[PDB]
């Protein structure tokens, strides 16, 4: 258990409460604001490097608990826990391969973790024990996000969304399943008043009411969303399109604003406490967007960003790029440091909670302590 308590929402974010792991330090890559709690003092030297082969969906990355150990996917099937100084606690084989997701913790040290094998494994977080499995009828396409009854919502590659409840195989586990028209790219995203969202390469928006799977309304763009939206207070989502713009949706589907981001989007959201929204784009920055949608600032790099920004309590934000670097910005965007690194760096950054920063490329993951 941590000092403080974790939550998905500052005053600013809209995202459904769900039954994540409240004990843990980050129990969840997505579905929550991505502004930690905690500080950083981190200045950019390396604690240490593990080889850790990975190709992540939507820049998924690693989860940490209580006790700052930090759960972690490889595409060669397994899935390691390791101590904080880097020593393997426990491995568990035979996963699934080509594609990592996120461990996402759940209540009563439950491991969620969809398998290319399409399954759906359910892991005691403790020992990488299996409890069980859930077939699923395609591989998996997103993380596992948790409403606040326990349900889990993925995609599949099958073109589906799938609500399972979070329950052995002695009873039924599906709640509900949506067929959606095209492939999906934005994976599900819940938002207070109950709705998910996703969206397809066929162009399709859909808001579905997460309690029945019924559509609530749908649009369709000239290009496709991708990766992991945010929500703010209101219920607006902001979510990155293909066409090279930040869309802004309101609850009841018009059109806010959007944002031209010089290129198509390639990294999922962050929402910080004062309505501002970061995301990444092909052209090789990294935006922070107001609330109105007026530019705050842009980082440049020099290759697509694809790592979801992390911000920490101070405003700081962490983020890499194709450029093959680990970047740290103050709230203004000037460069804090950088780190250069072997493989481009698209596994979104955790912070623990003494400051130290974990971040993942396709070969290694690293972590950046305290000074």
Excluded: C
């Amino acid at each position: 258990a941590a000092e403080t308590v974790f939550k998905q929402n500052h005053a600013a974010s809209g995202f459904l409460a769900g039954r994540y792991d409240a004990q843990a330090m980050s129990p969840t890559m997505f579905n929550w604001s991505r502004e930690s709690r905690f500080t950083s003092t981190a200045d950019g030297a390396l604690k240490w490097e593990k080889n850790v082969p990975a190709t992540p969906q939507n820049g998924a990355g690693a989860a940490v608990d209580g006790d700052g150990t930090v759960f972690i996917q490889s595409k060669d099937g397994k899935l390691t826990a390791y101590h904080p100084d880097g020593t393997v606690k426990w491995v568990t084989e035979n996963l699934g391969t080509t594609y990592t997701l996120t461990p996402v913790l759940g209540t009563n040290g439950v491991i969620y973790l969809p398998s290319h094998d399409k399954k759906l494994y359910f892991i005691d977080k403790e020992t990488g024990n299996i409890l069980w499995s859930v077939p699923l009828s395609g591989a998996p396409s997103s993380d596992a996000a948790i409403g606040p009854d326990g349900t889990l919502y993925v995609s599949t590659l099958d073109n589906y969304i799938y609500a399972i409840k979070p329950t052995s195989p002695s009873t039924g586990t599906q709640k509900w399943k949506f067929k959606t028209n095209g492939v999906v790219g934005s994976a599900p995203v819940l938002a207070s008043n109950g709705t998910l969202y996703t969206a397809t390469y066929n162009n399709i928006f859909y808001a579905i009411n997460s309690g029945t799977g019924q559509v609530k309304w749908s649009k369709t763009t000239s290009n496709g969303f991708k990766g992991y939206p945010v929500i703010d207070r209101d219920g607006t989502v902001y979510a990155g399109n293909q066409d090279g713009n930040l869309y802004a949706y309101t609850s009841t589907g018009a059109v806010k604003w959007t944002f031209p981001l010089n290129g198509f989007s390639s990294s999922s959201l962050a929402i910080d406490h004062n309505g501002n929204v970061y995301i990444g784009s092909g052209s090789g920055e990294l935006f922070s967007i107001s609330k109105t949608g007026n530019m705050n600032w842009s980082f440049y790099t020099d290759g697509p960003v694809r790592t979801a920004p992390l911000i920490d309590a101070d405003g700081n934000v962490y983020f890499g790029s194709d450029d093959k670097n680990v970047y740290a910005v103050d709230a203004d965007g000037n460069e804090k440091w950088r780190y250069q690194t072997d493989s481009n760096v698209i596994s979104s950054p955790v912070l623990a909670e003494d400051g130290t920063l974990y971040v993942g490329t396709y070969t290694k993951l690293l972590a950046f302590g305290a000074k």
